[PDB]
């Protein structure tokens, strides 16, 4: 039958916060999301710091150089 | 109706942005 | 909506294979290199001037006086090398995993290689240092070895009887534009790839197990982009003059040849194959065939297995061909004296022997071992 | 005589560590595609899974446990008899087209 | 009990609207914090050798 | 020959620090996303 | 042995309800239940009383790939409220 199909054990791959199969995940869910989405946000902040500097440097080359500012 | 707090929050997000690089 | 649908079928829900290693990341990096060279390059050309009177002064003007001009220059100069590292990975991947079986994709590739070689060669002339001038004077003059019209072909290319102001100014025009032809060709490189789908490391049809490009390979190619950026910025910020030659900081002088004359590192294997043969024309044809033999690779294929993953003899000969290329790259860097002449001679024959003779025979034996 | 080194090469090839038979790794072309199309439901749906599992292994950079590896003695050549016929029919069509 | 990271999720970045406001403001602060820190680290690494260290000298 | 020398090494420090920060964070996002496939389990169930 | 033990455990009075609906008098139903159903046992042996442990909801997928069948059936759901929750409305 198709009722012979049970889902294999993911206890190896699971997080610690959802291992107890007698426990409602909802209390941990917000923490589990908050952890992963923090990584993403921290990455975006770190790139945003870089991107700002890279762009600003190219913009500054297009601006007035040292030798023109000197003899102005 | 419902996009007023969202568009205000995105209005803030965009605003600080122009402060962000400049 | 007609554009988004192109970008969907290109990058969003293109069915990629599930099991693609980091050797497929180099394609996206080559585009990132091409875009990096274009964006850095544009900003260099905003200050650079292509006259022999001003060319050197302008490059130094960029480094010294243009605000953050140095960081843009060395990102261009080392990015050029990173483009080439990425290329040699991207070409080798296809050699190993049998991706050359997408004939048109591969043959467009072979074009893409040659255009970048021309781009980077002409780019190197631009700053007008000794090695730039003398690199051009050596490498261009090779064409005079052609049977009946080479001597004319060279003077036409130069715009005179030597490398000069006529050559430099057109070399700038050719540099600034050929990258866009490369990008145009590259979109056709991709166009044939979607027709044929993408290959995986096993060399086995992965229609049974596909996954959407986004979000899997988007975040993977992003990860790989940072590693390319890291590798660039390590070179730019800690070792900008490492891969580059010192003599190019000496302003060009046609009345004084530097002693150890050579191309950049990414042509040294081909330079070594040229030096191997003593006859001039033969040296040029071997130099040419060293690159163009890539086009014969899909015809030289013999094994009933597509990928080298399940092919020991081929794997060893492939990894021999890599080592042999690294030998030729080394030899091309060294001067033409003993013992390097004989090492270069053997390495050069070994190169064509691995491709033409051995690796096909290996595949044929590998078949006979498995009852094919 | 050299069944030994044939068996060595089989193990050295390594597709057996992924749980693939020899004919799962054959490079597709017009003949092979046609032979694979001619396969009956069972052998087709099996090679589907054998390949689907082998790719899933290749993704994770792993191989099967040593007992689950394919055996040189128990490596069935399921695709050959069909592929031989497809090739022989193509050769016939070419030999007829010659005249 | 509301946890450490869940308290961030719940009020700071559940919405994608506030997600960006957090990133922007966090990046605004990060820039000041990191630059200042890494400047000071580089300046302590290279003590006495830069102009700002020997500027009082000739001024 | 190299007036940029000081400034360039400061960018160097900041680059190494920032790459040190980002590479694991990005790799973590990659692993977080690919997890779905990397843990998956294939079951073959033909009929008789 | 399993069926009878499952019956002896679970089929009992405090865990059961007798419902009725139609043209009938509540008093009469209660007399019938008193006369026939009051023979059921009313508590346990001091153990064997199973009480429901809460079930872990797991966000996850199952993909029975079968091209031979004519139409794909998909069922997607998030964790529910439970019988008690007013939110149900
Ligand atoms: C993807 C980005 C990965 C991070 C890159 C690390 C460098 C980012 C960064 O912020 O570097 C510092 C920055 C300058 O900092 P300061 O010398 O303090 O100048 C004043 C700053 N307001 O210089 C750089 O490293 C920029 C280099 C950018 C390289 C990325 C190029 C992207 C190519 C596409
Ligand atoms: C010189 C620099 C080369 C450094 C790279 C060495 C990589 C070492 C390595 O991993 O080799 C073994 C490994 C085994 O992979 P599979 O056969 O698919 O089986 C997977 C089993 N889990 O082989 C590979 O990764 C093959 C990749 C080949 C690309 C290398 C290209 C190097 C450059 C060559 C120039 C090109 C020619 C013109
Ligand atoms: C595939 C793309 C490109 C490659 C591989 C490439 C390669 C090179 C190389 C190797 C140099 C010499 C660097 C040095 O040692 O100084 C150079 C210089 C230059 N390139 Fe490019 N380039 C590319 C694209 C561009 C583009 C698109 C432009 C303009 C739009 C540009 C403008 C320049 C300029 C002005 C110089 C001279 C300044 C200098 O020497 O740094 N390049 N290029
Ligand atoms: C500007 C240079 C190049 C760009 C931008 C480019 C771009 C791409 C991209 C984006 C892909 C798909 C991603 C991948 O699978 O790696 C790809 C694949 C491929 N390219 Fe290139 N390419 C370049 C050079 C070359 C060269 C020089 C060759 C051959 C001489 C070549 C042959 C191929 C092949 C055979 C594939 C198929 C990969 C597979 O097996 O899945 N490419 N290329
Ligand atoms: C089409 C395609 C791309 C790809 C994605 C974006 C591209 O365009 C870009 C060019 C420059 C920068 C970023 C993206 C080009 C190719 C890949 O990476 C891969 C990687 C492995 C799956 C097959 C595949 N297919």
Question: Which residues is C16 bridged to in the sheet?
Answer: C211
Question: Which residues is F10 bridged to in the sheet?
Answer: none
Name the closest ligand to CA C47: 3
In sequence order, the 6+-apart residues with CB closer than 8 A to the CB of G75 are: none
Chains G and B are in contact, defined as 3 or more C-beta pairs closer than 8 angstroms: no
- Alpha helix ranges (H) inside C206-311: 213-238, 268-276, 280-292, 297-300
Instruction: At C251, give phi and psi (nearest 5°).
Output: -55, 145
Q: Helix (H, G, I), strand (E, B), or coil: what is residue E52?
A: coil
Experimental determination approach used: X-ray
Rg of chain D over all Cα atoms, to the nearest angstrom:
16
Question: Which residues is C17 bridged to in the sheet?
Answer: C210
In sequence order, the 6+-apart residues with CB closer than 8 A to the CB of D4 are: none
Name the closest ligand to CA C200: 4
Six-digit token string for G52: 């429901």
**Helices and strands in chain C: count of H runs, count of E runs:** 15, 2
In sequence order, the 6+-apart residues with CB closer than 8 A to the CB of C177 are: none
Residues written for chain B: 22
Instruction: At C226, give phi and psi (nearest 5°).
Output: -65, -35
Q: Of C207, C215, C221, which is best to mutate to test ligand 5, by the most ligand atoms within 8 angstroms of its C-beta?
A: C221
The chains found to touch A (3+ Cβ pairs under 8 angstroms) are: B, C, E, F, G
CB contact under 8 A, F46 and D45: yes
Six-digit token string for C187: 């979109």
Indicate the domain borders of chain F.
4-48
Question: What is the CATH architecture of D1-99?
Answer: Orthogonal Bundle (1.10)
Residue among C112, C120, C135 at smallest CA distance from C252: C135
> How many Å lie between the centroid of ligand 1 and the Cα of residue C71?
10
Cα separations (Å) of G71 from C129, C208, G74?
A: 70, 19, 10
**The ligand 1 atom nearest the CA atom of C226:** 1
10 Å Cβ neighbour count for B2?
6
CB contact under 8 A, E30 and A30: no
Q: Which residues of G touch A25 (CB under 8 A)?
A: 56-58, 79
User: b/e per residue, C144-156, with b = 16+ CB within 10 A?
Assistant: bbbeeebeeebee
User: What's the CA gap between C148 and C39, in Å, rounded?
Assistant: 41
Q: Are C117 and C291 in contact (CB under 8 A)?
A: yes
User: What's the CA gap between G77 and G58, in Å, rounded?
Assistant: 11
CB contact under 8 A, A61 and C67: yes
Q: What angle do CA B7, B13, B16 make, to 5 degrees?
A: 135
User: What's the CA gap between C11 and C215, in Å, rounded?
Assistant: 10
Residues written for chain G: 89
Phi-psi region of C160 (alpha: psi -120 to 50; beta: other; left: phi over 0): left
In sequence order, the 6+-apart residues with CB closer than 8 A to the CB of B21 are: A52, A55, A56
CB contact under 8 A, A39 and F21: no
Q: Helix (H, G, I), strand (E, B), or coil: what is residue B5?
A: helix
- Cβ of residue C132 lying under 6 Å from some atom of ligand 4: no
Residues written for chain F: 48
Residue among D47, D38, D37 at smallest CA distance from D77: D47
> Is the preceding omega at residue C34 within 30 degrees of 0, hence cis?
no
Cβ under 8 Å to D: C residues 79-98: 98
Instruction: At D74, give phi and psi (nearest 5°).
Output: -95, 25
Six-digit token string for C227: 């590693």
Q: Are C120 and C244 in contact (CB under 8 A)?
A: no
Nearest protein Cα to ligand 2, atom 5 = C89
10 Å Cβ neighbour count for F7?
14
C285 inside 8 A of chain A by CB: no
Active site residues of C: 194, 198, 220-221, 264
> How many Å lie between the centroid of ligand 1 and the Cα of residue A24?
45
3-state helix, strand, coil in chain C (%, to 5): 75, 0, 25
Q: Helix (H, G, I), strand (E, B), or coil: what is residue A43?
A: helix
Q: Which residues of D touch C367 (CB under 8 A)?
A: none
Instruction: At G42, give phi and psi (nearest 5°).
Output: -115, 0
CB contact under 8 A, A8 and F41: yes
State the nearest Cα–Cα gap between F31 and chain C, in angstroms.
9
- For the four alpha carbons of C342, C347, C352 and C353, in that order, the dihedral sign comes to positive
Name the closest ligand to CA D59: 2
User: What's the CA gap between G50 and G48, in Å, rounded?
Assistant: 6
Listing DSSP states for C94-116 in one string gives HHHHTGGGSHHHHHHHHHHHHHH
CB contact under 8 A, C67 and A58: no
CATH of E1-59, one of 3.30.420.40, 3.40.50.1580, 1.20.5.260, 3.40.1800.10: 1.20.5.260
User: What's the CA gap between C95 and C205, in Å, rounded?
Assistant: 18
- Cβ of residue C226 lying under 6 Å from some atom of ligand 1: yes
Six-digit token string for G11: 């089929």
CATH of F4-48, one of 1.20.5.100, 2.60.120.10, 1.10.10.60, 3.30.565.10: 1.20.5.100
Question: Which residues is C129 bridged to in the sheet?
Answer: C251
Strands (E) located in D2-92 = none
Q: Helix (H, G, I), strand (E, B), or coil: what is residue C17?
A: strand
Parallel, antiparallel, or unpaired for β C210-212 and C15-17?
antiparallel
What is the widest separation between alpha-carbon atoms in chain A? 89
Q: Are C359 and C317 in contact (CB under 8 A)?
A: yes
User: What's the CA gap between C331 and C342, in Å, rounded?
Assistant: 10
The response to whether C194 counts as a known ligand-binding position is: yes
Q: What letter does residue C211 receive in the DSSP assignment? A: E
State the nearest Cα–Cα gap between E46 and chain F, in angstroms.
10
Q: Class for domain A1-72, per CATH?
A: mainly alpha
Please report how many Cα atoms fall inside a 13 Å half-sphere around the Cα of residue B19, on the Cβ side: 13
Q: What letter does residue A3 receive in the DSSP assignment? A: G
Q: Are D51 and D24 in contact (CB under 8 A)?
A: yes
Cα C163 versus chain centre, distance:
24
Q: At what angle do helices D30-38 and D80-98 cross, to 10 degrees?
A: 130
Question: Which residues is C211 bridged to in the sheet?
Answer: C16
Q: Are C277 and C286 in contact (CB under 8 A)?
A: yes
- Alpha helix ranges (H) inside C17-102: 26-45, 55-64, 69-97
Cβ under 8 Å to E: F residues 9-28: 9-10, 13-14, 17-18
Nearest residue of B to residue E30 by CA position? B20
> How many Å lie between the centroid of ligand 1 and the Cα of residue F7?
12
Q: Of C27, C79, C83, C182, which is best to mutate to test ligand 4, by the most ligand atoms within 8 angstroms of its C-beta?
A: C27
User: What's the CA gap between E44 and D55, in Å, rounded?
Assistant: 53
Q: Are A58 and C68 in contact (CB under 8 A)?
A: yes
Q: What letter does residue C128 receive in the DSSP assignment? A: -
User: What's the CA gap between A5 and G64, in Å, rounded?
Assistant: 11
Residues written for chain C: 372
Q: By CB neighbour count within 10 A (0-12 exposed, 13-18 middle, 19+ buried), where does B10 fall?
A: middle
Q: Are C95 and C88 in contact (CB under 8 A)?
A: no
Phi-psi region of F35 (alpha: psi -120 to 50; beta: other; left: phi over 0): alpha
Please report how many Cα atoms fall inside a 13 Å half-sphere around the Cα of residue D44, on the Cβ side: 11
F8 inside 8 A of chain E by CB: no
State the nearest Cα–Cα gap between A44 and chain E, in angstroms.
7
Q: Which residues of E touch B12 (CB under 8 A)?
A: 21
Residue among C44, C105, C39 at smallest CA distance from C70: C44
3-state helix, strand, coil in chain A (%, to 5): 65, 0, 35
Cα A31 versus chain centre, distance:
15
User: What's the CA gap between D45 and C180, in Å, rounded?
Assistant: 47
Q: Helix (H, G, I), strand (E, B), or coil: what is residue A1?
A: coil
Cα-Cα-Cα-Cα torsion D51, D57, D60, D62, nearest 10 degrees, comes to -150
Indicate the domain borders of chain D.
1-99
User: What's the CA gap between C32 and C30, in Å, rounded?
Assistant: 5
Q: Which residues of F touch E35 (CB under 8 A)?
A: 14
Six-digit token string for F21: 């920060």
């Amino acid at each position: 039958s198709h009722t012979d199909i049970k889902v294999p054990d993911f206890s190896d791959y699971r997080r610690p916060e959802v291992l107890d199969s007698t426990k409602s995940s909802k209390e941990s869910s917000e923490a589990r999301k908050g952890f992963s989405y923090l990584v993403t946000a921290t990455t975006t902040v770190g790139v945003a710091y870089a991107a700002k500097n890279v762009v600003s440097q190219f913009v500054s080359s297009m601006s007035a150089s040292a030798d023109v500012l000197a003899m102005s | 109706r419902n996009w007023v707090p969202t568009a205000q929050l995105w209005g803030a997000v965009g605003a600080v942005g122009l402060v962000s690089a400049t | 909506h007609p554009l988004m649908k192109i970008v969907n079928n290109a990058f969003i829900d293109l069915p990629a294979p599930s099991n693609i290693s980091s050797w497929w990341n180099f394609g996206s990096l080559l585009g990132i290199c091409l875009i990096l060279q274009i964006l850095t390059g544009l900003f260099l050309a905003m200050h650079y001037t292509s006259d022999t009177t001003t060319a050197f002064s302008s490059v130094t003007h960029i480094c010294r006086d243009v605000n953050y001009g140095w960081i843009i220059r060395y990102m261009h100069a080392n990015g050029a090398s990173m483009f080439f590292i990425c290329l040699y990975m991207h070409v080798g991947r296809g050699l190993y995993y049998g991706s050359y079986t997408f004939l048109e994709t591969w043959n467009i590739g072979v074009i893409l290689l040659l255009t970048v070689m021309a781009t980077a060669f002409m780019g190197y002339v631009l700053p007008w240092g000794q090695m730039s001038f003398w690199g051009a004077t050596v490498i261009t003059n090779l064409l005079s070895a052609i049977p009946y019209i080479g001597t004319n072909l060279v003077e036409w290319i130069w715009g005179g009887f030597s490398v000069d102001k006529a050559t430099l100014t057109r070399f700038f025009a050719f540099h600034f534009i050929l990258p866009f032809i490369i990008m145009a060709i590259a979109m056709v490189h991709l166009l044939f790839l979607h027709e044929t789908g993408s290959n995986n490391p096993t060399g086995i049809s992965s229609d049974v197990d596909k996954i959407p490009f986004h979000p899997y390979y988007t975040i993977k190619d992003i990860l790989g982009a940072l590693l390319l950026i890291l590798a660039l910025m390590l070179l730019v910020l800690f070792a900008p003059d490492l891969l580059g030659d010192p003599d190019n900081y000496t302003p060009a002088n046609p009345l004084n040849t530097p002693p150890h004359i050579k191309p950049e590192w990414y042509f040294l294997f081909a330079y070594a194959i040229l030096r191997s043969i003593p006859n001039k024309l033969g040296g040029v044809l071997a130099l040419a065939f060293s690159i163009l033999i890539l086009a014969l690779i899909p015809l030289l294929h013999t094994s009933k297995q597509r990928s080298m993953m399940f092919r020991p003899l081929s794997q060893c000969l492939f990894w021999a061909l890599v080592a042999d290329l690294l030998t030729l790259t080394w030899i091309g860097g060294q001067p033409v004296e003993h013992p390097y002449i004989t090492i270069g001679q053997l390495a050069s024959v070994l190169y064509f022997l691995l491709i033409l003779v051995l690796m096909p025979t290996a595949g044929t034996i590998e078949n006979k071992l498995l009852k094919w | 005589w050299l069944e030994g080194i044939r068996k060595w090469y089989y193990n050295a090839a390594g597709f057996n560590k992924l749980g693939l038979m020899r004919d799962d790794t054959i490079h597709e072309n017009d003949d092979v595609k046609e032979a694979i199309r001619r396969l009956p439901e069972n052998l087709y749906n099996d090679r589907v899974f054998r390949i689907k599992r082998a790719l899933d292994l290749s993704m994770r950079q792993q191989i099967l446990p040593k007992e689950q590896w394919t055996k040189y003695e128990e490596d069935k050549s399921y695709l050959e008899p069909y592929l031989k016929e497809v090739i022989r029919e193509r050769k016939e069509r070419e030999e007829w087209a010659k005249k | 009990a509301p946890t450490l990271t869940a308290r961030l999720y719940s009020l700071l970045f559940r919405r994608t609207s506030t997600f960006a406001l957090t990133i922007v403001v966090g990046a605004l602060f990060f820039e000041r914090a990191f630059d200042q820190g890494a400047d000071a680290i580089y300046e302590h690494i290279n003590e006495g050798k830069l102009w700002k260290h020997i500027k009082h000298k000739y001024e | 020959a190299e007036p940029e020398h000081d400034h360039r090494k400061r960018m160097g420090l900041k680059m190494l620090l920032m790459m040190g920060l980002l590479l694991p964070l990005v790799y973590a996002m990659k692993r977080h996303k690919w997890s779905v496939l990397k843990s998956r389990k294939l079951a073959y169930r033909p009929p008789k | 042995a399993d069926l009878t033990e499952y019956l002896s455990r679970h089929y009992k009075a405090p865990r059961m309800v007798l419902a009725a609906a139609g043209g009938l008098e509540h008093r009469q139903l209660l007399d019938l239940a008193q006369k026939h159903f009051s023979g059921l046992s009313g508590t346990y042996d001091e153990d064997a009383v199973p009480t429901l442990s809460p079930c872990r909801f797991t966000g996850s997928q199952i993909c029975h790939r079968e091209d031979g069948l004519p139409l794909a059936h998909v069922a997607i759901a998030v964790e529910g409220p439970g019988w008690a929750h007013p939110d149900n409305v």
